[PDB]
Amino acid sequence: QALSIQEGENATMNCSYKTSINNLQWYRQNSGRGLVHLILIRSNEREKHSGRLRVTLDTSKKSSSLLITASRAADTASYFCATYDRGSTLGRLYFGRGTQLTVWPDIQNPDPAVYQLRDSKSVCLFTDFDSQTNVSQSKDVYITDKCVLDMRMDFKSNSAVAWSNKSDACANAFNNSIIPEDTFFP
Amino acid sequence: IQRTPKIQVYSRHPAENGKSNFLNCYVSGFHPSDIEVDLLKNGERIEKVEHSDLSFSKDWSFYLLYYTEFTPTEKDEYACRVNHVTLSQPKIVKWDRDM
Amino acid sequence: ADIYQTPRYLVIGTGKKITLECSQTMGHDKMYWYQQDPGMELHLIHYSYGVNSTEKGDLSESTVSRIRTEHFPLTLESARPSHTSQYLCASSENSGTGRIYEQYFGPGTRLTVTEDLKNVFPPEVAVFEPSEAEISHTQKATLVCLATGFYPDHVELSWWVNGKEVHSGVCTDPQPLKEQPALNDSRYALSSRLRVSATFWQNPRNHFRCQVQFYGLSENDEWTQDRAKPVTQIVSAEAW
Amino acid sequence: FPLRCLQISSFANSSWTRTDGLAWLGELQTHSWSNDSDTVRSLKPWSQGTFSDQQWETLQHIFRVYRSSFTRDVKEFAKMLRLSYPLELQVSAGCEVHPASNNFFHVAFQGKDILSFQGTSWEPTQEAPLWVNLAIQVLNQDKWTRETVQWLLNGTCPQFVSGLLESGKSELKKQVKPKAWLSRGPSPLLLVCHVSGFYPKPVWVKWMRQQGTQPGDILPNADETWYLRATLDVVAAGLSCRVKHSSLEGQDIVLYW
Ligand SMILES: CCCCCCCCCCCCCCCCCCCCCCCCCC(=O)N[C@@H](CO[C@H]1O[C@H](CO)[C@H](O)[C@H](O)[C@H]1O)[C@H](O)[C@H](O)CCCCCCCCCCCCCC
């Protein structure tokens, strides 16, 4: 695997095969969708460009790298490398494991705080921390990990919620993870 | 299956009783490649029998050489037994020293 | 384009006969079926060169048919929990038309096979009002939606402000959480969040709604439990 | 002294397959290719010709990938076409140099020519099933393989053959004297002249008063010499057998009955 970067940063992913290949291609997948072909490089080529991504092929070391410049939330997905071992339709496409890439918001003015809220018709909210902060799963306690924003925008911020039907304090819910020292507590 | 095997038996050197020699069986002109070849001594198959690398001619038909060292004598009789899809019975060709 | 698959989601009982649909209107003679574990390695289980071509791949108990170019249906004779995964359908361009190397995929089918359909529960949906301490501390207001106790984890969540679905300010968990990581067929929880201006929330007129599309049983499924048949449905919670 | 590279691929079914090969320079076998071996085996000290080790290994790698790829492609044609097992394919490829060298690449299915490499692509031979005509369209997509074959026949082969001609020039011009002996065959009394152990292959054998002799086939021996039999059907004295061979520096072998 997993790779986490910030919007605007460049992302590089590694891939390696074993046998002889006619060409190598990279795919990306998103939750609830199928694979989408990104770019194809032949065995007699060393580098290929398209939009913001660039693929490099080292037939000697038998590996390839996928570079994504100016990482953007839209880039968040699973990336797969697949090799094709024929110059005809008798070829076999071989897929690798695939690494999860997540592009987090670049938060210039971070302001970590833990707010509580009642259930209209009992929830703690840890938000406004920078993208390099990781939340950890709790012990019958419920803690979610940093959420992913959706492309389709205006409001951009990190948040992780904790909840419990027990009346037994948000000021101690996220202590399980590595939260900012100056984290605000109302 | 279309081409039956030709079978020829002969010695490396002139037949001399009690004198070491090589017995040869050359099987050619057959197809497909699958074939069973035994060198017989008095009707019983010979063991450590060698053969060349399977090969074929311009007409795609296969040929092969089976051979083994033997010591001929007045009594003992040697022959080549070939089994191939192109034949209902395994064909046996006797080694006729005076032939 | 393109290629189509139904159903997107499916939960079925152990040992039932399943038929996954795949169609393609690109005229591709060559098609493929894949079995995938979420984010994991893809396994070719079937492929086809064209009409009447039905070949087994390097991988399970299933068959395919190719009576027509357009259709390449997959059938699961029986269903074991081992058949819990994603099923992707793909195709490749004909020689002379375009590059033959890439494969075009469908949306895929997310299949869950459970030991007992009594484990299928619709989500409970709750919306939590923005904290007061946040409204004066950041001049903003974040609503939190909680979808809990559902199974399978076949869910689609969205926010609706005054009749319109909103995206900006929305931050949803990538994957549903396991209620109890222990239990094999544990239930799941998913949280989302909609942030807006601290003045937009105070507005008693503005209506907010968290919608959770759930995928479960169909009318075709049998049910004899003393509770509402956990069929496909939308469960919502809201606030003003 | 043309170079003949032979291939024998046997497909009993979809699960059992063997490919074996060997190389002939003229009448001599220079290489053996066992399906039980990763590499092609050199039979002679000069089998590598003039090619360097790095060169020879390059060719070595090409045969590995080719053996593996060839057999899988056959299986896929079997499915696609689709053909019944068992299948048996034979490849004959190589060249021979001249003071303009010529090259060839023929493949036989079930012992019959189906296609050969002609120019820059694959073509069907006159006697070829319609399916072969289809298998060609697929093969001709593989542009790279199409160039490799073109380069192997027109470039690699003529060079490797020139390397062999000089590296093993002495063993190619080597001379081996045959020993001969007479025998009485089965009566039609037919006289038999045996001539074994001669190299190279070319030979002359006739019964002398020249007579109406019936020469048999030139059979091989295990050590790469040849055997021959000349029989004459006569009524049961002054008859002789004459043997003319290059190893015999004008000294024809003569055996009287
Ligand atoms: C002639 C040169 C002699 C040099 C000196 C030799 C000395 C040693 C002699 C050894 C004696 C035994 C020799 C064995 C018999 C002779 C074999 C010689 C033929 C060598 C052919 C080499 C072809 C190289 C191309 C190849 O392997 N293709 C591979 C892989 O290619 C893939 O990978 C490549 C990179 O690795 C590229 O990416 C390519 O695009 C992709 O498709 C591809 O799979 C090709 O199909 C080659 C296999 C079939 C080729 C012949 C087809 C004949 C027709 C068959 C018809 C079947 C019909 C249904 C029953």
Residue numbers in the entry:
A (entry chain A): 8 to 128, 133 to 150, 153 to 165, 167 to 182, 184 to 201
B (entry chain D): 1 to 99
C (entry chain B): 2 to 60, 62 to 242
D (entry chain C): 8 to 106, 109 to 197, 202 to 222, 227 to 253, 257 to 277
Sentences from the paper on this structure:
This reactivity is initiated by the recognition of the CD1d-lipid complex via the NKT T cell receptor (NKT-TCR) followed by Th1 and/or Th2 biased cytokine secretion that can regulate the activity of other immune cells such as conventional αβ T cells, B cells, and Natural Killer (NK) cells. They have been called Vα24− NKT cells or CD1d-restricted, Vα24− T cells due to their use of alternative Vα domains rearranged to Jα18, paired with the Vβ11 domain in their TCRs.
The purified TCR was co-crystalized with recombinant, soluble CD1d loaded with αGalCer; X-ray data were collected to 2.5 Å, and the structure was solved via molecular replacement. Overall, the Vα24− TCR recognizes CD1d/αGalCer with the α and β chains oriented on CD1d in a parallel fashion unlike the typical diagonal mode of MHC-I peptide-TCR complexes and similar to that of iNKT-TCR and Vα10 NKT-TCR in complex with CD1d/αGalCer. However, the binding angle of the Vα24− TCR in relation to the CD1d/αGalCer surface is more acute than the almost perpendicular orientation observed with the Vα24+ iNKT TCR-CD1d/αGalCer structure. We have also noted residues in the CDR2α loop that make water-mediated contacts with the αGalCer galactose headgroup: Ser50 and Asn51 both establish water-mediated hydrogen bonds with the 4′OH of αGalCer. In contrast to the sequence and contact differences at the CDR1α and CDR2α loops, the residues of the CDR3α loop in the Vα24− TCRs adopt a similar conformation to that of the Vα24+ iNKT TCRs.
